[PDB]
């Protein structure tokens, strides 16, 4: 009846529940646009699979199901935890890439949660609730998967040679899988330490974004989480320092930048708080990030990695940053984007 339905999910991984909702969508529309959220990020335990991997998984399960792939299109969405309007527009762009001169368009979202959000943000499309009487727990799936087990009742395919089932079987023979398991164990041990604390803690960290001649200073991580990923230099706030002091302390600690306090104090543009509750796999971590801008500087200050940085580099803006946009810790690509727009550049 509608020309286009719009379906949004993370699909980490795709499972029977996602499938049911796509079946409902197609009983109500001729074509379903599948938008995959949280694309263009490096693998982490919550988001182990890339856009292309998830897209391939979905296609293989829809064929198992077997839904005609001409009735299905798949598009990526980046994370915009702090810029909802960019996400809203990015979704629109995905749809109108496929929608034609006054196609009817409906979002086949969720009668329970998030419905309110889509209704308000997309008044111009209709809404179809589906929800959602079977509890397909994405976290529970991954936890067993990190323990070597693929939960069959989630899998569209019952044959390990096919579908997402097949993808996951092969994926367990990879180095990335081994890295995910290592990160996961790190996270389990970390959380265990905090079990008999009277309250769940909100952790506080700091980062420094240092721009010198359109080059960003980035460290390559030694430790979990985000082992081997690139990140802004930063770390935990200690109990006896101000945030402003911490930002500078961690910067020197990890990069040994050849600049003085006063030079950085002159260069400081702003601090911003990043508080999206799921930004970090460790627990609830809030980051305060200072922007420091140096223009027409005589050269790039000397730097060398130490403490929890195993490498450190100046990285020119434009192509070299965009290039590692999916090799960055947590939400740092978003943080860099926002500070350069709001306080930069």
Interaction of residue 235 with Mg ion, rule CB under 5 A: yes
SS (H, E, C) the chain: CEEEEEEEECCCCCCHHHHHHHHHHHCCEEEEEEEEEEECCCCCCCCCCCHHHHHHHHHHHHHHCCCCHHHEEEEEEECCCCCHHHHHHHHHHHHHCCCCCCCCEEECCCCCCCHHHHHHHCCCCEECCCCCCCCCCHHHHHHHHHCCCCCHHHCCCCCCCCHHHHHHHHHCCCHHHHHHHHHHHHHHHHHHCCCCCCCCCEEEEEEEEEEECCEEEEEEECCCCCCCCEECCEEECCCCCCHHHHHHHHHHHHHCCCCCHHHHHHHEEEEEEECCCCCCCCCEEEEEEEEEEECCCCCCCCCCCCCCEEEEEEEECCHHHHHCCCCECCCHHHHHHHHHHHCCC
331 labelled binding-site residue: no
In the region spanning residues 295 to 314, those forming contacts with Mg ion, defined by CB under 5 A, are 308
253 labelled binding-site residue: yes
String of contacts with its own copies for each residue 219-238, x by CB under 8 A: -----------------xx-
Q: By C-beta, is 26 or 237 nearer to its own copies?
A: 237
- How near is the Cβ of 224 to its own copies at its closest, in Å? 15
Interaction of residue 179 with Mg ion, rule CB under 5 A: no
The site partner of 273 among Mg ion, its own copies, Cl ion, none (C-beta below 5 to 8 Å per kind) is its own copies
Q: Kindly tell me which residue out of 185, 188, 223, 277 binds its own copies, with binding defined by CB under 8 A.
A: 277
- How near is the Cβ of 84 to its own copies at its closest, in Å? 11
- How near is the Cβ of 249 to Mg ion at its closest, in Å? 8
Q: What residues make contact with Cl ion under the rule CB under 5 A?
A: 139, 142, 235, 308
Interaction of residue 129 with its own copies, rule CB under 8 A: no
Which positions touch its own copies (CB under 8 A)?
193-194, 196-204, 236-237, 239-243, 271, 273, 275-277, 283-284, 286, 288
């Amino acid at each position: 009846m509608y020309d286009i339905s719009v379906f949004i999910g993370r699909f980490q991984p795709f499972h029977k529940g996602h499938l049911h909702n796509i079946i409902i969508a197609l009983q109500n529309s001729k074509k379903v646009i599948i938008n995959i959220g949280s694309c263009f990020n490096t693998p982490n335990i919550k988001n182990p699979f890339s856009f292309e991997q998830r897209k391939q998984m979905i296609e293989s399960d829809l064929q198992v199901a077997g839904i005609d792939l001409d009735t299905v299109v798949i598009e990526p969405l980046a994370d915009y935890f702090y810029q909802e309007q960019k996400w809203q527009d990015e979704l629109r762009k995905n749809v109108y890439k496929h929608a034609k001169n006054n196609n009817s368009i409906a979002i086949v979202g969720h009668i329970k949660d998030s419905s309110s959000y889509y209704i308000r943000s997309f008044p111009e499309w209709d809404y179809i609730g589906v929800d959602n009487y079977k509890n397909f727990n994405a976290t529970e799936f991954r936890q067993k998967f990190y323990n070597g087990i693929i939960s069959k009742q989630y899998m569209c395919s019952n044959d390990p040679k096919l579908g997402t089932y097949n993808f996951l079987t092969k994926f367990m023979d990879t180095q990335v899988y081994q890295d995910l398991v290592a990160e996961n164990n790190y996270v389990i041990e970390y959380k265990r330490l905090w079990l008999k604390a009277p309250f769940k803690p909100n952790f506080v960290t700091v980062d420094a974004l240092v721009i010198v001649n359109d080059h960003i200073l980035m460290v390559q991580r030694k430790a979990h989480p985000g082992k081997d990923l690139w990140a802004l230099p930063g770390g935990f706030l200690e109990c006896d320092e101000t945030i402003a002091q911490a930002i500078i302390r961690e910067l020197f600690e990890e990069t040994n930048i050849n600049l003085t306090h006063e030079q950085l104090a002159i260069a400081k543009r702003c601090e911003k708080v990043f508080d999206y509750p799921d930004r970090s796999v460790r627990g609830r971590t809030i980051s305060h990030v200072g922007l420091f801008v140096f223009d027409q500087w005589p050269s790039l200050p000397e730097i060398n990695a130490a403490d929890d940085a195993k490498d450190v580099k100046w990285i020119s803006l434009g192509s070299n940053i965009k290039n590692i946009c999916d090799r960055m810790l947590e939400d740092h690509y978003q943080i860099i984007t926002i500070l350069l727009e709001e306080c930069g550049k």
